[PDB]
Design a protein around this nucleic acid. Structure first.
Ligand SMILES: [Mg+2]
Length: 70
RNA sequence: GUUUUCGGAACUGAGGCCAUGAUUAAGAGGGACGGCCGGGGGCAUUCGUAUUGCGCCGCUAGAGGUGAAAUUCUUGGACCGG
């Protein structure tokens, strides 16, 4: 703060809410995050976009690295 | 001449009497009816998410699959979310 124009006009006490569609199946992990509606997504990261081993895509190691980028 | 009811055999109508004549109701069966009961059967009827595909929309570089990988789908926006 300021950003500036990105993000809505907010106060100190209150906060803006989003939704994280965490599709953590086997063989991969998705930490998709969107607006409160669900359709205007903000940041989409998956486990495979970080690990290059093609087998750890659902491993816990890939899982939190993707989430922190979100 | 025979009369032969005569001997017996023939059919038919009105009677009495017979305690007048039907064992039982199977921890057999069949039925009947009463209140139910049951993912029993058939015909229609309605609902549910899911899957697949589609049309938009935002979004981005991988997605899928495997013990690992690959065939495969991917800037024609794949996968994801509405
Ligand atoms: Mg693949």
């Amino acid at each position: 703060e300021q950003v500036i124009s990105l993000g809505p006009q907010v106060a100190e006490g209150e906060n803006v809410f989003g939704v994280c569609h965490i599709f953590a199946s086997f063989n991969d992990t998705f930490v998709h995050v969107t607006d409160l509606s669900g359709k205007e997504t903000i940041c989409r990261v998956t486990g495979g976009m970080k690990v290059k081993a093609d087998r750890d895509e659902s491993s816990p190691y890939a899982a939190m690295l993707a989430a922190q980028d979100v």
